[PDB]
């Protein structure tokens, strides 16, 4: 799949993750997108995380459709600078 | 392997995650299902965890039964969205 | 490589880990497996973690040991049950 | 890939997480070793983690640069224990 399309989807799921935090949890933009990448790449901190059913239900759907995007496209990664 | 046997397997997995921490850690259904998919994806919050021994036990169980599943569950995914 | 040997060498991995949480952070036998299995599994809710130098140190040597170890033996357990 | 040049990848990205907490965050050497080898492997216990936005922007960068090429490390050193 060419790296150049896997880019783009993982960008998308990091916008997705990030306005949805940052409506439904009410934090910052910046901590939206942090947020976002610690979980998509399953380091879940938890120093930021859902304190609402809405929030919790978003974060499952995150889960689901970033963990995978976002394991592509560091692997696809590592193909260029390695 | 069929992709939906696979979603079956992940699915009873969740139920048995979910159930699981409600009945032994009492927390809500709603907050437990959202800790099965985050211990699942092996992300981690930690909002949420075991305070009792055998909800230890159990986590564990549900760690090695669920961390593959899930895996599994989320490539054949990747399969179908790309 | 045969699943019986995958399955001794995640068991040493248990043992190493468990025992030391034990005798270097003072955790209970109990808390100290459920620890272990938390953090190869790369879980890491953080309700338990090192509070001291040799027990970093020494979470550092689990981490790079166990992760793969267990990642192993996860997908072969998988081919088993599946 | 020569796993001697992946041993390499590793250890600058250990450089490069451990020295940047450091400086960035302000937690000790040792610490700092133990968040990098704790975030790269997606463990994230979460009892460090940054609280300026400049260390959220490089926590990012260490997740992107650093798990896929922990990944592979750990995987070339299973080879050669196994
Ligand atoms: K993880
Ligand atoms: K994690
Ligand atoms: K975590
Ligand atoms: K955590």
Same mark, same amino acid.
């Given at each position: 799949?060419?790296?150049?399309?896997?880019?783009?989807?993982?960008? &998308?799921?990091?916008? *997705? !993750?990030?306005?949805?935090? #940052?409506?439904?949890? /009410?934090?910052?933009? %910046?901590?939206? @997108?942090?947020?976002?990448?610690?979980?998509? &790449?399953?380091?879940? *901190? !938890?120093?930021?995380?859902? #304190?609402?059913?809405? /929030?919790?239900?978003? %974060?499952?759907? @995150?889960?689901?459709?970033?963990?995978?995007?976002?394991?592509?496209?560091?692997?696809?990664?590592?193909?260029?600078?390695?």
């Amino acid at each position: 799949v060419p790296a150049t399309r896997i880019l783009l989807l993982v960008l &998308a799921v990091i916008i *997705y !993750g990030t306005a949805g935090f #940052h409506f439904i949890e /009410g934090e910052s933009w %910046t901590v939206s @997108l942090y947020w976002t990448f610690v979980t998509i &790449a399953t380091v879940g *901190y !938890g120093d930021y995380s859902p #304190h609402t059913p809405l /929030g919790m239900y978003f %974060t499952c759907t @995150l889960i689901v459709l970033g963990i995978g995007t976002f394991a592509v496209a560091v692997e696809r990664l590592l193909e260029f600078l390695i």
